[PDB]
């Protein structure tokens, strides 16, 4: 069990020992932004809890020179003694220091290091990155990120998240840059040979992959929250005109925030720095809080309406952050979801406290669907679940860990009630701050909360309380929600609710919802099994309005409905996580209530409605034409949602058909969509005028006009880019209907062309972003692979957007064969450049193939993936894409004839 | 996050 040089290495896990445990670093770095390395040092601060001759930690890719062992409790270490043997084992990431003395149990030790490297030059560790000035001017920065495990390429340490430690941090550097971190700059000194040295405040306790510093040249602008946070937005000096509204969202929303949680931010300030090449959308070391520029940055000429929701979305999800995953972290990567379902979750609540002008609390089912599509297939996993290697933890962040959390969580804040939900939020909070978390402990917190404070006198909490029915009551409520959550989290999948009404007597069963595998089929019963949840139903009827709720905690059972009413609807506003189906004429009734009066039906109602009769066609439980039946209505729907969900599954279809070359059925969508809804696509400004939805609803329905040739719309586009493209940028196209212009003007050479050279002059990433797109929508292969080389380059196209590109480029017909191959052809230099690991790579794996959908493709898809095992490549994302490729396959051979009838059908009446 | 996706439209 043991490398490099011979040796035994002392240690076996790749869990760190816990006899050793860290207590603060000192860290000095200096790094070099024209040799493009560093030179660093620490000292560690450890405390030792049992008797050990050797430490082991987490290092890679760090050439340690130096390495001394001090005491001022064990005078065997007394300055300046004793050197350590380091030894160093890379297939676990870690290094042995080798002591002398076996150490003495309770007695403080100082480990020091000197150590050195380049600058990383991929996106990880501490590594170079470069931008473009107005001038044309090219500079570089330094900059750290090292979520989940690239810590240990920055600096040697303990590198998991149980091991908070005080982190006391020092730069030096050139006059021409500053430096940040974590904290506020303590102090500069002047150096002799010119040089500054950057000291900043000590951290306080926190985990190492939370750890950050940036060298670099870039402006500010600065505000202060009501409790005296100091804000800054950085970004490099062109762009300072950019960071307004960023710096308008994050006063607000942290102030939110600190309402919220009843817990103020720790540090003095906080900085939000806008990094040109970031690989993650965003970062939230504390204190330092990373983005893309298109995550942060907003110009009102070019940036859309829906810029702004994902630039706040984003800021609200870090922020969010500094106490979920900062102040309050989890114990080890398998519950991951304590921070991410979180911040996910607290998005929605943030955002709509700060800014309900943007809708965001109509976007969310969205979360869960996205969902639902991998929780319906056997290879997904339960929210919590193991994970030990590098790339095994980077799989935990996925959209079982963001969407499933942030969608059961919500369903919980529904159960609980708003007030009972934020105080187990704060508890939770305040009970774990600086230190850990696990997924039980979080579920105690929950399940524990009190109403009105506490609660008072003798109510349940605390002090003194009287012994009631109500007490009793309370205590055993609490552990049922205890009981019901941890099965939300240790169970795969999303279970199916199937209600049977018969006059009053509602039989309920629950079912583990299963995509493409029917009702009955030779291994649907096996995977059934001992799926069971606790599920809290909600319904209202057609008679009622009044929510009616109650907890199905078995495989089956019945309720007793007064009235006996026409329709039932249960999961009120979608807000539980399960698919509801009806037997009987429960369907029927629900569809005939919409095409006479759907406004009787909750807006929210209505969308999950949508959501589940086409999820259950997949499902082999109703045919496609009940569906395609229900979206008649939509000709009357004006609560875009809905309108919006319903639409989508009709172009997602056409684009199906398209990509095949099932041509009499893609024309008959294309004419039943411009015909049916030719009322509201019509009545669309070429403007940024309206309301937040407005606004969406118009690139939404003109940029779908515009995808299906609709004539008026590619003339008015052409228009649009002719003017522009003729006025050398000096006319405005409004921001929501950009990329829509872009696209059309980029169908020819010289309109292509000219916007390829507009990508390289432009100032802002977010129409840089819109013309990618555009390039992407290129009918010519000469181009597409021209995209898809320079992306590969990383100069003109940079890297980080190599992935996107991919996607892009592959999702239409003209790219998807090219796309495939060019990864196929390929894989090797992807590697080069990307984790395996990266959100890159399973991005550019699924968005190359999960389209695919004759047996054929399924044929090459499995033999890449085989052939990727062997290389050791595994990847859960291989199974995903499998398993959707043979949904798509069993759903066209099951109604596709459907769809063709019921096409030519609607053609004849009427 | 790393869901800068939003990768396109
Ligand atoms: C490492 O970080 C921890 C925080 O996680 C630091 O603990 C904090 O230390 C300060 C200073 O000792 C404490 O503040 C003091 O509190 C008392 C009463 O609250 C007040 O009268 C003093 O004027 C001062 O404000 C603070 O309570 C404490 N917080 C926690 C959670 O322990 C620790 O100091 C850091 N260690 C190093 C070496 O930097
Ligand atoms: C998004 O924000 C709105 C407000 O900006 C939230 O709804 C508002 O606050 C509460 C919800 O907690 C609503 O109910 C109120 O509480 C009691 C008991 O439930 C009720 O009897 C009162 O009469 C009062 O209505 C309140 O009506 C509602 N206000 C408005 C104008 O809608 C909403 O919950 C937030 N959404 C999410 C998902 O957090
Ligand atoms: C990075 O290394 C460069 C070496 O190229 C250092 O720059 C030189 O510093 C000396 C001492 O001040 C000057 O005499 C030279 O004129 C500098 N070279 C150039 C090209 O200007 C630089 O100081 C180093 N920076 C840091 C932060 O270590
Ligand atoms: C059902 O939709 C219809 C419109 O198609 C509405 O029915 C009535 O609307 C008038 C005024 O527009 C009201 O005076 C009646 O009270 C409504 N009917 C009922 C039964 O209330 C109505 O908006 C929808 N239904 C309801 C219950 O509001
Ligand atoms: C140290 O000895 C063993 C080894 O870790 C452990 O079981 C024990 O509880 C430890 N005790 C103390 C005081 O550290
Ligand atoms: C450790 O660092 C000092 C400089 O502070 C240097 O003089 C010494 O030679 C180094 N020792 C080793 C073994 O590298
Ligand atoms: C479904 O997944 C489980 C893993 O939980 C596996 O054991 C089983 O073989 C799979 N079955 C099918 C039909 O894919
Ligand atoms: C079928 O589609 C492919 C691209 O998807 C295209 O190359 C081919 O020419 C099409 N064939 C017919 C008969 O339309
Ligand atoms: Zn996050």
Redesign the pocket.
Known sequence: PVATNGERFPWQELRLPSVVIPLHYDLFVHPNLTSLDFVASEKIEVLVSNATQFIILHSKDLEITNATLQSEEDSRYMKPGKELKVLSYPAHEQIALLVPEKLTPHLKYYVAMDFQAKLGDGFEGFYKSTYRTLGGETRILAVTDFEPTQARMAFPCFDEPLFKANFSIKIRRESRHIALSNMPKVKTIELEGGLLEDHFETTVKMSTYLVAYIVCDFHSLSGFTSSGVKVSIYASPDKRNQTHYALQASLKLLDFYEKYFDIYYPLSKLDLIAIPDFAPGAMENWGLITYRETSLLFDPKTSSASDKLWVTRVIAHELAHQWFGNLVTMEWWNDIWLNEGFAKYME??AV??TY?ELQF?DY?LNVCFEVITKDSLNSSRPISKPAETPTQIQEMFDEVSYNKGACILNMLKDFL??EKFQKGIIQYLKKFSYRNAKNDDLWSSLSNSCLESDFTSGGVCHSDPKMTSNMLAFLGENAEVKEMMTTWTLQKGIPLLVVKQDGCSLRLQQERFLQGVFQEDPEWRALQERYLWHIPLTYSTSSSNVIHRHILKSKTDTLDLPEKTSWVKFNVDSNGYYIVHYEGHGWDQLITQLNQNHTLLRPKDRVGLIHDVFQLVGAGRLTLDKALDMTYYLQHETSSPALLEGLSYLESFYHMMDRRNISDISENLKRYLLQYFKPVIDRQSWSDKGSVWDRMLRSALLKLACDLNHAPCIQKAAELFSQWMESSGKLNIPTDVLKIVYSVGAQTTAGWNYLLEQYELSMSSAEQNKILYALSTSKHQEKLLKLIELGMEGKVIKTQNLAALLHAIARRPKGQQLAWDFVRENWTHLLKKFDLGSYDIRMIISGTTAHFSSKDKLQEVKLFFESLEAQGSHLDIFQTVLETITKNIKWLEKNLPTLRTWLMVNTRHH | XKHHAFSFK
Do not use: Q
Request: glycine share 12%; net charge negative; charged share 20%.
């Open positions: 929605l609540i709509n406290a309900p609390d969310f009630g708003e």
